[PDB]
Design a protein around this ligand. Structure first.
Ligand code: ACO
Length: 210
């Protein structure tokens, strides 16, 4: 028995504590790199909270057992000055992850897919406690965002998935692929950077129009 609630600002510490136990250790790229202590990922995770569209799953005892942290993304301005997230990161392992994100954005702009949309919801960090996996919590967190989207006239939910494992969860929830890149093909300076196990196969950007 669990509830799905809006993450409040005072929940920051508890959200980070939960993510340090799970996501920091067990998201495929984090685990592949052995991310360790990573204040930059704490910062990255906390950033979207004041957008007021991030959700926690909470068990009967009041413990956070899952989160889906979301942020609003806005179409680049006509005069936009594009920036690389990796440039401002001093943590070498997390910088590899941000550089992969920057690379995806250089190859693929979700706003090209949806020329009429000015605001899109971005699903940034999704994590469920191991003892509560396989129960549909990721789907219940995801679907709570549809309520926010309705209330605010947002049509598109965009989620960059770091493995085919998490892309399949989004597919089951009615998302479809809009971009993919195999890890075997990500060679930004001429050589492979990420070589997780075969089943992960690479990134997939997933989208749903709700
Ligand atoms: C934007 C991003 O954050 S991308 C990165 C996404 N996050 C991660 O990779 C972090 C590590 N993974 C996790 O935290 C979780 O596996 C999640 C969040 C991806 C999925 O959460 P869940 O609430 O377990 O999702 P769900 O209940 O749909 O289960 C997904 C699949 O896991 C498998 N599964 C079944 N039981 C379990 C279990 N005990 N433990 C693990 N996986 C299980 C099944 O294949 C299941 O699919 P199915 O139920 O449709 O057959």
């Amino acid at each position: 028995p669990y509830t799905i609630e809006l993450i409040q600002p005072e929940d920051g510490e508890a959200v980070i504590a939960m993510l340090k136990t799970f996501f920091f250790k067990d998201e495929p790229l984090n685990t592949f790199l052995d991310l360790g202590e990573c204040k930059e990922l704490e910062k990255y995770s906390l950033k979207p909270l004041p957008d007021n569209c991030s959700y926690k799953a909470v068990n009967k005892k009041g413990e956070i057992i899952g989160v889906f942290l979301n942020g609003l993304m806005r179409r680049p301005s006509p005069d936009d000055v594009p920036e690389k997230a990796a440039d401002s990161c001093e943590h070498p392992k997390f910088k590899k992850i941000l550089s992969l994100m920057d690379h995806v954005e250089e190859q693929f702009n979700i706003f090209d897919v949806y020329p009429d949309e000015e605001l899109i919801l971005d699903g940034k960090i999704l994590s469920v406690d191991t003892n509560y996996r396989g129960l549909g919590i990721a789907g219940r967190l995801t679907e709570r965002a549809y309520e926010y989207m309705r209330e605010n006239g947002i049509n598109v939910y965009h989620v960059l998935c770091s493995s085919h494992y998490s892309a399949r969860v989004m597919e089951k929830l009615g998302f479809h692929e809009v971009f993919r890149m195999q890890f075997a093909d990500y060679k930004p300076q001429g050589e492979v950077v990420f070589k997780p196990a075969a089943p992960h196969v690479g990134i997939q950007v997933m989208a749903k129009e709700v």
